[PDB]
Amino acid sequence: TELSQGTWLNKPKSVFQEAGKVTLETDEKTDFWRETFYGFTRDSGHFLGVETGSAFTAQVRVQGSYESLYDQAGIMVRIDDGHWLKAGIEISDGHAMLSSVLTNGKSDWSTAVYGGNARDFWLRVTVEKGVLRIQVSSDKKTWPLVRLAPFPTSDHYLVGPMACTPERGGLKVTFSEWSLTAPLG
Template identity: 30%
Template sequence: MKNYNWLNKPGKFSEDEQSLIIKTQKGTDMWQRTHYGFSKNNAPMYLTKSSQKDFIYEVKTVFNSQYLYDQCGIMIYLNENNWAKFSSEYENDKFQRLGGVVTKDGYSDWATQDIKSSINTIYYRVTRETNDFIVEYSFDNIDFHQMRIFNLAYGNIFNEINVGLYACSPQGNGFEAKFISPHFIVK
């Protein structure tokens, strides 16, 4: 994949022009302070920069998560203290969580909804409108549903943003996350 760079490069991964596979490692996560009292910024992220003020970014994720908190999805990254991730997160063999974390000024929040544990494919769509972002998901790449609308920098204008892919395993022994055909659509 062209024009992507690693932040926290994983030990095992493979890629071609259309896809990326990450084998996650135990102890990797993205979280800042709130509720749990810890900060983790070591999840592998494969990011590309965009200075487009208005764009749409889409990707298909396929995963076989199996350990508590295994997660894969999309990352919108300004810096260590200002970022957002949207992903599936494994809970148990009955359900997993589909949710998003928005981190501002070093504090994360988390909003979720339960989905079936048998789901192993999710499509994500991020729409940027200057500093505002709209995040949607789909299980079939036809019907998309809104997850969140947020402003990443409290109205302060920023020119460039990193957007891309991430996967991590805070507790488990790792899993394989596949990202297929990430791409931009300029609005």
């Protein structure tokens, strides 16, 4: 199922398509977070979701121009506003961080300094039998694990590009090299 068959949640004011690619500029005050610690909920982030069956593997290339605190881009898997995962690069603390947030009612955020090129990376996500696995790659050859966690079973998921700027907008990101299939095995 091709990238252009996705549906937007919070379509950005500025976005254009090329064959197999989506290029967007984020709007201000866009974020995804539920409750934990900060005591607010946000469901305003940009998400282009492609609908899946009950299990899938998805992969995408992410080329963002990060420049400010909290700038984020990557991939999201979503069931609804209370059950989702986002993963990718985020600017937090001192550096470009590889970050993931698994939300099941409430958000669970993990982060670490990213050792690759923040401006060009791939993500691969697999959901099957109530387990989500996230892998990242700097070369499309080797795919280290980022996260392995329970995730609710569902007849369908939405999966696809995500990007957020919780403060000032203007983050430019291109998504390409999309693939969505059943998991191996």
